[PDB]
Amino acid sequence: MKAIFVLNAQHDEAVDANSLAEAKVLANRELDKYGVSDYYKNLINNAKTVEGVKALIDEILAALP
Fold first, then answer.
1. Separation CA 65–CA 52 (nearest Å)
2. Sign (positive/negative) of CA torsion 40, 44, 60, 27?
3. What sign for the dihedral angle of Cα 25, 27, 31, 32?
4. Can you list the pairs that 23-32 forms with residues at least 24 positions away whose Cβ atoms lie under 8 Å?
5. Options 3.40.630.30, 1.10.8.40, 3.40.50.720, 3.20.20.370; CATH of 1-65
6. Spatial distance between the Cα atoms of 18 and 23, rounded to a whole number of angstroms
7. What is the C-alpha to C-alpha distance for residues 30 and 37, in angstroms, rounded to an integer?
8. From CA 13, how far away is CA 11, in angstroms rounded?
9. Is-contact 31 41, C-beta < 8 A?
């Protein structure tokens, strides 16, 4: 049944498990720091990927010149 090389990026002991939390926690505090609405922080909680978390703030911060 062997087919995938031992070293691979498919999965490992460390996974996105401990990443969305820090990503959401680091992005969420900035909202609280700025004092924006709580609707945006709730939306981050529903983020399905870090790129979605960082890219969502970029759109929100961009709308603030």
1. 21
2. positive
3. positive
4. 23/47, 23/50, 23/53, 23/54, 24/53, 27/53, 27/54, 27/56, 27/57, 30/57
5. 1.10.8.40
6. 9
7. 12
8. 7
9. yes
